[PDB]
Design a protein around this ligand. Structure first.
Ligand code: ATP
Lengths: 613, 615
RNA sequence: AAAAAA
């Protein structure tokens, strides 16, 4: 609109600037001149002194650019040129960039700047030979007397290349982001200088990410996250090859992924090693802790030769069962230790399962739950990091029915649900460690306890809590079927035997009900064909559309972290692409019991968290 | 190991090319000089004849452009240059451009070409003033010794600006796609001219789209469809300001959206006007159809002054339905007319609700449904243009289960639910119309709420089928809770009494049950106030803010006398502040709650994303 | 029309 500015760069031909100034339809108000620390400017100053009263010249000079010996001379020019544009607070509709003067690279740089910063008009001034001069037919060099005579004689030509819109986040920036080091500036004649070439790096990053996103924009629906669209073709191709857990490069990459944990038990964290001693070393009543009875693991335990029944499986964690956690001091220590382990693993969101009733001899179950929530809430507050001041790992609680088989069962589940329902109401802050769901494994499978569970669990749905059902031993399709439809569960633990029931598998995928697989737990309790009991159903379920996640289950009892869980899934199912591991994380995100606002934050937190190769 | 081609532009001062060819550390082949109907090339040809046996020189002359006079002169050169780049094969790893020579615009265009097209090296040749002549200390302009002396003495510089990435879709394109028309040619040198400005607009299209997609990226998730993020800043700004139903510009826009219909009844539709007459002219037993008696619609039926109740609304339009659609010709014509209506309305996916067992004297309900399915399937085969050679509109079927007041209606429910199980499993062709769900419609009452048919619906869940329900049509939130948790419903119909119970509203949003609303019918039954002028406020805008997956459907088109576009337009008029962005959320919500395979859901996602029209 | 607008 108003206040059209002019950006021109000249070499040793001073007449360029006055020629470009009187571009037909100019109405200029401030001409800016870019020089090279050689040519005289007394003519441009003279021209704009006699018949250009207010034009507000700025003659930038680019210190230390006398000649063009090497490209380092040119690179110093590009950084100065870009910062020179921003030093004048001018919009795209005000720049009338002219590319005429200086070396060809100097002029070509002016073209690039206008395209990637926006310019209302980019033109180039010509002058046919009409000044007679000493030798015949010289273009007009002779001050104002001939330049004015050139305009009215129909000599100067203005080839205009039209406007340039420029990139949406380049056409304002701010001059203070990339300041100019003024050195030795006289009246309206400044020798600018740049301390670093940050803008050149900043601009290059933006063009290449814009190129990558455009080159891979055809298939965003398949890409689990948006940030993967900013990857090179090679990296994207590398992402679709089968995972190689043997390769150290793959192992490092998986360890760096932001992960989501959904099936982790608080009572099976530190059952061996130094961690068990750490819990015992922090006890309020050291006289009452049972003697060290660390169990003996099966030969080659992390990858056992033969599967073991669940009876011997749970017995591997007696050293850290209810015996050690009845003391309130040990309970806080383990929660801190488990939280620290999760952050080291890189988990951005976890749902630690727990059963406060088991750890309640003198204190009430509510005291156990209050201590558990306080222990996690303290850690989340203390481990304050990440953008926006959000906790490094957000931990929610899911309550499990007591593993104890003695005592009345109807009341035991009644206490379980009643504790959870009031727990959800007691702690209601969204960003705090909040109880989000219940587990209903062990309440059924007792003289056809489906009917009792189908009516004594309606309170959970009425109060708004979530329900996850951990399918037990020899999970039949009917047992899963009632878990999906009779009691409205939203996640099914394990449930390996689901491919047999094709119709149920269609129903699970269609309703988007999550499935919580855990490799080492499954391998160490049921046995599966490792490398080259049927095949592990992880790959098959994912192709169908089942919301499948990879979790840890017990950590200490399995002696394997979540990072190891993802690696083993490749060994259990040869064929997992590195893209698939990212799908599992998104499936965990979209089936977690967090809220919509928290889900969006995790999605973008995970999106810009994936380590590039 | 690369072949290392060279690209260079020539002005009136030749011998640039030998200098460019003498770039240290590269054995170039197939030099590709540019000239413009003027500069001499004898010196360049001689140099390669005598000092470069087989480096395969080529020269092009760029059309009838000989003196820079207007922008059309430059624009002609630019597109000739770009095609000349493509005509030369091979990609970035081979290119060695040299922006030296020619006009300033020619040099500037050369660098831009390498930037947006890929180049292994961009350099510029500077010749020192180390030769003599009429002036003295002059350039090495001519001769063979001077250039060779320039190299051997070493007073040449070759400032190198480093390689460029180049946009991957612009690294090869295809020379055949953008041919460079060739005019009179001798050996080596030739003259070419571009017929149209095809490449310039193509490249401008990519960069313009890349700019918009880059800026509107940090907030992409707020966009329902990814393809939306290629619009101007104003267009995005215009898309967020509230919809104006009265504005003709918006009315034409909404009529252009690709819609998805989830809640539409075959029993219904044409009940007045020419549409009903058309059906009865296709009957194959004209003597059996009942006489012409179309029930009298109340005053201003599209926007009635008073809310009629549910019992009356069902009997509005009895001239079409159980009585009329008994002739097999009438049933086929109903399906044909609805499909044409849907395609004209722009719907890309519909789920027509029907009750085939309502139509049986000699034709069994299976026969009637087979005819309905065949009637739609042949229509989909007919109007099979679409994008990608698909059906124009994909129509699926949901069998209704009515429960009126009395009689042996539960046997009809038992028959519909059993029929759906057999039918859905029988027609497994993914690309063809097939029964995908059941329904629970009719008279909603506390006596027959949602859960008195839980024993009846067990078979449907076992076989695997979607289940909808009309919970909340006129009952409280408790009816909705029964439908969600005792029937395991996947889509609630007309769930208006849902905002009262906060836990249910959160539970529905968290699980993802789609709430099927319909503006005209809800205005014509519960009498919601219009234009923000007592049933209460309409919850459409409330549901979207809370995150409940909601969609705007049509119910009976003829009985409500309003199409899908009318329903969408009325929603903004009936819920003030409804942004045009929210209309796209409804389509996204409808897509993610529709009963269809994942493969089809992906296909619709791309089709709807590209179908959204700019203002 | 390469070290400085044709
Ligand atoms: N908007 C609506 N809300 C609730 N129930 C509806 C609505 N529209 C139709 N119904 C009921 O759903 C079923 C739809 O029947 P359909 O349209 O296939 O045939 P019909 O000949 O019109 O039926 P009928 O005379 O029994 O209502 C019937 O039970 C109808 O009462």
């Amino acid at each position: 609109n108003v206040q059209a500015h002019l950006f021109v760069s000249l070499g040793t031909a001073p007449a360029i600037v006055p020629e470009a100034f009187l571009l037909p339809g100019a109405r200029f108000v401030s001409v800016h001149v870019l020089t090279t620390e050689r040519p005289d400017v007394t003519l441009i100053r003279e021209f704009f002194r006699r018949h250009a009263p207010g034009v507000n010249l700025t003659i930038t000079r680019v210190a230390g650019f006398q000649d063009l010996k090497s490209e380092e001379d040119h690179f110093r020019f590009e950084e100065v040129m870009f910062r020179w544009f921003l030093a004048s607070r001018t919009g795209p509709e005000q720049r009338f960039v002219c590319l005429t003067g200086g070396f060809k690279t100097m002029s070509a740089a002016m073209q690039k700047a206008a395209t990637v910063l926006g310019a209302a008009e980019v033109f180039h001034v010509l002058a046919d030979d009409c000044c007679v001069g000493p030798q015949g037919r010289l273009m007009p060099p002779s001050t104002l007397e001939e330049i004015l005579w050139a305009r009215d004689q129909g000599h100067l030509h203005w080839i205009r290349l039209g406007p340039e819109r420029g990139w949406p986040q380049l056409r304002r920036i701010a001059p203070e982001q990339f300041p100019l080091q003024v050195v030795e500036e006289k009246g309206d004649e400044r020798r600018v200088q740049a301390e670093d070439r940050a803008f050149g790096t900043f601009l290059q990053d933006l063009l290449q990410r814009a190129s990558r996103i455009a080159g891979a924009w055809e298939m965003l629906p398949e890409l689990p996250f948006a940030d993967l669209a900013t990857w090179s073709e090679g990296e994207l191709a590398w992402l679709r090859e089968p995972l190689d857990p043997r390769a150290p490069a793959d192992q490092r990459w998986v360890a760096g992924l932001p992960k989501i944990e959904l099936h982790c038990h608080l009572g099976g964290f530190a059952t061996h090693g130094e961690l068990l001693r750490r819990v015992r070393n922090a006890a309020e009543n050291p006289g009452k802790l049972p003697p060290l009875e660390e169990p003996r693991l099966p030969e080659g335990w992390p990858l056992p030769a033969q599967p073991i029944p669940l009876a011997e499986y749970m017995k591997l964690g007696n050293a850290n069962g209810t015996a050690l956690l009845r003391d309130p001091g040990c309970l806080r220590e383990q929660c801190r230790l488990l939280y620290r382990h999760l952050v080291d693993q890189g988990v951005c969101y976890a749902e630690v399962r727990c059963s406060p009733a088991n750890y309640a001899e003198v204190r009430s179950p509510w005291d156990v739950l209050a201590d558990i929530r306080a222990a996690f809430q303290e850690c989340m507050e203390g481990a304050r990091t990440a953008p926006g001041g959000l906790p490094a790992c957000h931990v929610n609680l899911i309550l499990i029915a007591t593993r104890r088989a003695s005592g009345d069962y109807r009341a035991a589940i009644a206490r379980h649900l009643a504790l959870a329902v009031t727990a959800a109401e007691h702690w209601r802050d969204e960003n705090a460690c909040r109880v989000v769901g219940v587990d209903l494994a062990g309440y059924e499978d007792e003289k056809t306890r489906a009917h009792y569970f189908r009516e004594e669990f309606t309170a959970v749905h009425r109060c708004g809590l979530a329900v996850t059902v951990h399918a037990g031993e020899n999970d039949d399709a009917e047992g899963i079927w009632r878990a999906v439809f009779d009691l409205n569960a939203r996640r099914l633990g394990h449930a390996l035997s689901l491919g047999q029931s094709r119709e149920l598998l269609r129903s699970v995928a269609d309703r988007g009900i999550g499935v919580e697989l855990c490799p080492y737990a499954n391998l160490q309790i049921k046995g599966f064909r490792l490398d080259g009991p049927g095949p592990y159903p992880l790959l098959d379920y994912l192709r169908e559309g089942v919301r499948v996640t990879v979790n840890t289950d017990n950590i200490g009892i399995s002696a394997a972290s979540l990072t190891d869980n993802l690696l083993l899934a490749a060994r259990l199912c040869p064929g997992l692409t590195r893209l698939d591991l990212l799908h599992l994380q998104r499936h965990a995100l979209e089936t977690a019991f967090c809220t919509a606002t928290q889900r969006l934050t995790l999605l973008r937190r995970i999106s810009s968290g994936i380590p590039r190769p």
